[PDB]
Amino acid sequence: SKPKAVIFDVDGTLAKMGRGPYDLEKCDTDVINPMVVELSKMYALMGYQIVVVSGRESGTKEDPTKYYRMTRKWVEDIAGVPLVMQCQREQGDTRKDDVVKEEIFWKHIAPHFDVKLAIDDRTQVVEMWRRIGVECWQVASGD
Amino acid sequence: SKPKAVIFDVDGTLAKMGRGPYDLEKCDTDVINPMVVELSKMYALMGYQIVVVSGRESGTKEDPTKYYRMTRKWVEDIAGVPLVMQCQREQGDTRKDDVVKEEIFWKHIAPHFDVKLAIDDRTQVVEMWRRIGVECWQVASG
Ligand SMILES: [Mg+2]
Ligand SMILES: [Mg+2]
């Protein structure tokens, strides 16, 4: 009986989409998506553990966690999401989001949490969560 | 300065979809979609006005609000959702869900509420909400 959890995505979900999508160097200035961010705070107060998962590459070759650290600072200090765990696509991983996010899920999250719900904006990712038996709410079209 | 509201759909959203659509008298025995129903309680507690909107025809030719009243009772008594307003397809309206729900929005919801969010399951409707500038979360495939 693992503690109950909710997974949130970052891009398009917690954070709005102002810059280039793969231009992570400017991602520290992203704008919060208010209802989704409020949702994460709501779930945390209700005793769900919040887990953040992003397809953002963690960094560059010379700085492998550069973007992970930027993302984390944005989530924690700008959005104020009270997460207990953050997971990203490792530097050099070029597979599709749904493939990576599924791997992250089975390897790092599922053994520790009982994930009741995932929040995301991309159809391919949304269908993956649903397919492996995780309720998922799509919060935007994803285009 | 209107009160903030969240719109919830009923079929496939608040209620799981053992019964057929348009068989609305076996409708009283629907089972809750728990994460969504819990959401509506949370929002209500956080001071949002809960507005339930549904494509279900409101009743029969003989009784124009028979189905409306059945839906209302399930939402209030079984789901436990503290709603403030309920809007459905009028008896004998045969237009599409998204045309009906949009007309409901302009005439009965938008004048009284600042709608911050709509929760729904059907793609055609979800697209309508986003198209008219209302954030919408799609909680299952449609
Ligand atoms: Mg995203
Ligand atoms: Mg529906």
Curated annotation (Swiss-Prot), chain B:
Q: What domain of life does the UniProt record list for this protein's source?
A: Viruses
Description of how the protein assembles with itself and partners: Homotetramer.
Q: What does this protein do?
A: Acts as a 5'-hydroxyl kinase, a 3'-phosphatase and a 2',3'-cyclic phosphodiesterase. Catalyzes the transfer of the terminal phosphate of ATP to the 5'-hydroxyl termini of ribo- and deoxyribonucleotides. In the presence of ADP the enzyme also catalyzes an exchange reaction. In the exchange reaction, an excess ADP causes the enzyme to transfer the 5' terminal phosphate from phosphorylated DNA to ADP. Involved in countering a host defense mechanism which activates T4-induced anticodon nuclease and shuts off viral translation.
Q: Provide the protein name.
A: Polynucleotide kinase
> Could you tell me which species this protein originates from?
Enterobacteria phage T4 (Bacteriophage T4)
Its encoding gene is what? pseT
